[PDB]
Amino acid sequence: PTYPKYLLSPETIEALRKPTFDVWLWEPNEMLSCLEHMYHDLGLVRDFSINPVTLRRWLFCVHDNYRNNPFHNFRHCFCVAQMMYSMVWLCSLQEKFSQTDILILMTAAICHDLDHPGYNNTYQINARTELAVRYNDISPLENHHCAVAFQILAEPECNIFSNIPPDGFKQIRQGMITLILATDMARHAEIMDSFKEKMENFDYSNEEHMTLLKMILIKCCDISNEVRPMEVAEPWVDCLLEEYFMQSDREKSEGLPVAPFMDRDKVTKATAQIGFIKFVLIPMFETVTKLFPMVEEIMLQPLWESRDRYEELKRIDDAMKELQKK
Amino acid sequence: PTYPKYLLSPETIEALRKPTFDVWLWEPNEMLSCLEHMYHDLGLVRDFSINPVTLRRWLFCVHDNYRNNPFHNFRHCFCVAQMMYSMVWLCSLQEKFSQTDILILMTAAICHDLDHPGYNNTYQINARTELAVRYNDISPLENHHCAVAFQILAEPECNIFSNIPPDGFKQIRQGMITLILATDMARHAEIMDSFKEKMENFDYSNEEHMTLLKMILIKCCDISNEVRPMEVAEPWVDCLLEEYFMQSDREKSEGLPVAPFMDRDKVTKATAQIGFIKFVLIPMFETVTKLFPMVEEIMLQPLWESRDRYEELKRIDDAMKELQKK
Ligand SMILES: COc1ccc(NC(=O)[C@H](C)Nc2nc3c(cnn3-c3ccccc3C)c(=O)[nH]2)cc1
Ligand SMILES: COc1ccc(NC(=O)[C@H](C)Nc2nc3c(cnn3-c3ccccc3C)c(=O)[nH]2)cc1
Ligand SMILES: COc1ccc(NC(=O)[C@H](C)Nc2nc3c(cnn3-c3ccccc3C)c(=O)[nH]2)cc1
Ligand SMILES: [Mg+2]
Ligand SMILES: [Mg+2]
Ligand SMILES: [Zn+2]
Ligand SMILES: [Zn+2]
Numbered sequence: 001p002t003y004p005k006y007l008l009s010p011e012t013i014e015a016l017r018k019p020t021f022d023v024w025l026w027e028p029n030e031m032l033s034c035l036e037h038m039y040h041d042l043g044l045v046r047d048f049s050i051n052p053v054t055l056r057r058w059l060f061c062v063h064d065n066y067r068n069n070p071f072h073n074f075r076h077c078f079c080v081a082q083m084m085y086s087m088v089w090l091c092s093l094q095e096k097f098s099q100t101d102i103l104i105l106m107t108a109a110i111c112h113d114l115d116h117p118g119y120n121n122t123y124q125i126n127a128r129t130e131l132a133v134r135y136n137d138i139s140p141l142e143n144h145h146c147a148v149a150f151q152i153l154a155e156p157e158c159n160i161f162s163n164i165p166p167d168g169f170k171q172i173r174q175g176m177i178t179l180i181l182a183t184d185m186a187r188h189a190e191i192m193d194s195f196k197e198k199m200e201n202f203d204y205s206n207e208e209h210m211t212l213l214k215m216i217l218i219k220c221c222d223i224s225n226e227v228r229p230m231e232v233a234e235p236w237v238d239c240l241l242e243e244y245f246m247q248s249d250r251e252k253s254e255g256l257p258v259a260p261f262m263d264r265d266k267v268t269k270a271t272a273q274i275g276f277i278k279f280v281l282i283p284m285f286e287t288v289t290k291l292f293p294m295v296e297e298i299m300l301q302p303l304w305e306s307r308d309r310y311e312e313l314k315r316i317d318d319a320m321k322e323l324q325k326k
Numbered sequence: 327p328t329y330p331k332y333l334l335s336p337e338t339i340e341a342l343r344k345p346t347f348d349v350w351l352w353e354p355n356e357m358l359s360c361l362e363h364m365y366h367d368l369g370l371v372r373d374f375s376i377n378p379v380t381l382r383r384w385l386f387c388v389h390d391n392y393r394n395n396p397f398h399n400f401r402h403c404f405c406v407a408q409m410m411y412s413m414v415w416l417c418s419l420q421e422k423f424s425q426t427d428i429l430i431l432m433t434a435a436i437c438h439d440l441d442h443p444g445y446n447n448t449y450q451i452n453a454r455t456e457l458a459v460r461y462n463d464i465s466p467l468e469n470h471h472c473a474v475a476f477q478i479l480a481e482p483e484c485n486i487f488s489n490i491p492p493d494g495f496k497q498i499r500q501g502m503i504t505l506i507l508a509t510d511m512a513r514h515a516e517i518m519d520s521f522k523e524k525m526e527n528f529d530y531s532n533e534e535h536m537t538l539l540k541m542i543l544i545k546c547c548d549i550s551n552e553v554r555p556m557e558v559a560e561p562w563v564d565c566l567l568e569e570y571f572m573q574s575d576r577e578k579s580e581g582l583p584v585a586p587f588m589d590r591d592k593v594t595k596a597t598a599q600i601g602f603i604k605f606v607l608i609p610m611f612e613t614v615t616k617l618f619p620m621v622e623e624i625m626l627q628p629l630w631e632s633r634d635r636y637e638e639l640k641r642i643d644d645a646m647k648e649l650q651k652k
Pocket of ligand 6: 183
């Protein structure tokens with residue numbers, strides 16, 4: 001017949017394995033279904049005896065704890081989780097990783113931005129917010145995301161880990177905290193340097209080596225929008241700027257310092273992305289290719305195309321702003 | 327928070343394992359949810375690699391193929407399956423049957439009345455209907471139910487058996503055909519004897535003994551309404567008689583012979599159940615108790631009560647009639 005949206009079509013489930021997945025077509029429930037599918041399709045529900053109904057109540061509770069920010073919302077959480085899923089296949093991670101590592105990667109991806117307020121760490125700190133005070137100015141948001149993540153898992157009806165031995169729970173919790181805190185871009189340069197150092201002789205058996213690979217992987221998925229088709233990727237830039245402007249506006253109406261790349265008067269869609277793709281996204285993915293070559297053709301390619309389009313879009317912006325000058 | 331209806335609550339997941347579960351409390355979505363749970367709970371999803379999304383579409387296609395009959399509708403098949411599920415627990419059937427036989431048992435129960443027209447075989451045959459002509463008067467309805475069942479499983483996106491090797495599929499299909507065809511009451515006495523015969527020295531090793539046991543199991547669940555609590559059971563009697571009268575009226579209208587037990591001028595809710603419980607239901611469960619003693623308390627007990635209740639209800643009924651000519 002013609003089943004309800006909650007049910008994915010076999011086509012959708014096939015496309016769910018690729019980074020070309022159009023994340024914009026779905027309602028929260030269809031997304032919840034794709035997330036649910038990923039846990040089954042990866043052996044996680046199986047290998048960790050996750051109660052199938054609990055998996056769903058957990059996903060609803062998670063979704064319920066994301067806010068309606070223009071960027072940091074549940075759909076962002078979904079893109080990140082969905083991209084991570086694509087990489088588990090693209091790079092055949094289940095070969096290099098244990099199921100516990102996969103559990104940690106996916107679960108951290110889904111919870112990495114829980115309860116985000118829409119104003120980054122810098123605002124929190126400069127505004128001396130309740131979060132900044134609670135976390136002594138140390139990765140306040142990310143710390144907060146973890147806390148909320150484990151508060152949700154503390155509710156028995158949502159505890160997708162209730163059938164995991166405490167020894168393994170401790171390992172999963174430690175892994176998730178490390179990954180969620182690694183998403184703080186303040187630590188980008190440091191983490192990248194650490195990874196590249198280990199890269200001088202990677203070892204899939206070295207535990208510190210694998211922890212950095214996972215940190216790099218979740219970081220990759222978190223900021224991978226431009227890896228997607230321009231039609232799917234662009235609307236995200238607008239949401240990010242919408243959130244950025246909202247913060248800077250507030251920072252101005254409070255005399256608090258403002259960042260150039262978040263300032264209405266100094267940034268454009270293209271200037272936001274050119275620097276980012278060239279000095280952040282590409283280098284990070286570039287070093288990952290050395291570990292997984294297929295990454296180049298599937299993710300480094302669209303990034304070059306992306307970087308090129310904005311570099312052109314920038315010339316037109318300038319040309320139009322020169323006819324607005326006096 | 328408050329999760330949608332298709333997410334079963336713990337209290338429901340536990341009541342679902344008993345013949346005492348109240349089937350009239352749910353809507354198709356909730357019932358579709360309970361069925362899905364059953365497959366997960368019995369580990370059928372596990373041991374057969376049933377893609378969980380595929381299972382959802384399938385149950386949905388099955389629900390679409392049931393008709394708005396007063397008795398033979400989706401809710402009826404839900405009862406049959408739920409009762410089957412109950413017995414797997416009560417009787418610890420997984421201790422006697424393989425996961426293949428439990429799959430056959432459960433799947434057959436859900437499909438046993440697919441696309442039922444609302445008029446029994448006697449009607450199909452006397453009216454020389456298309457089904458009667460298609461099946462040469464041999465169990466036209468049961469053969470049809472089975473055929474729709476496999477027409478549904480033939481749709482790639484509904485084939486919950488997609489990951490079973492063809493060797494296994496064959497075995498599942500033969501079992502299902504056997505079980506669904508065994509539900510034709512015209513075959514009752516015949517099947518009861520084969521079973522009673524082999525019961526003299528039942529042997530779970532013997533494949534023929536197991537086939538008869540499974541045939542008895544699906545037959546028990548298919549007509550088990552009276553095993554359920556008087557409140558849950560009674561409404562079904564009305565649904566059945568409604569369906570029966572619909573047929574008898576049409577038969578009288580088209581000059582076709584009418585069955586006494588479907589005659590509006592002879593049948594009464596009471597007389598219908600006394601004969602049925604005493605001569606069909608109780609005798610069948612009595613023989614099953616010899617293999618599963620726990621059945622006597624959980625199923626025979628409520629049947630004795632129901633029998634006495636309708637028998638008293640018959641005295642009242644007579645008393646009331648004679649009070650109308652004295
Ligand atoms: C101090 O650490 C940082 C912070 C920001 C940036 N780059 C940006 O924020 C640029 C200007 N905008 C940008 N930021 C992006 C994108 C994707 N995620 N993402 C993002 C979102 C929240 C926090 C940080 C970043 C990078 C993106 O496509 N563009 C680079 C490094
Ligand atoms: C020839 O096979 C039959 C057919 C009917 C009966 N007796 C009945 O149908 C009695 C009068 N009504 C009855 N019939 C019932 C019940 C449950 N299923 N069920 C039923 C439904 C469809 C076809 C046959 C039966 C027995 C029930 O609780 N009562 C007994 C034997
Ligand atoms: C399978 O169809 C049957 C046949 C018999 C019964 N049980 C009875 O015969 C009931 C308990 N006693 C009874 N039943 C009667 C009478 C007349 N018709 N009738 C009856 C009741 C239900 C169904 C068919 C008939 C003929 C009657 O005088 N007494 C119940 C269902
Ligand atoms: Mg974040
Ligand atoms: Mg039937
Ligand atoms: Zn994020
Ligand atoms: Zn039936």
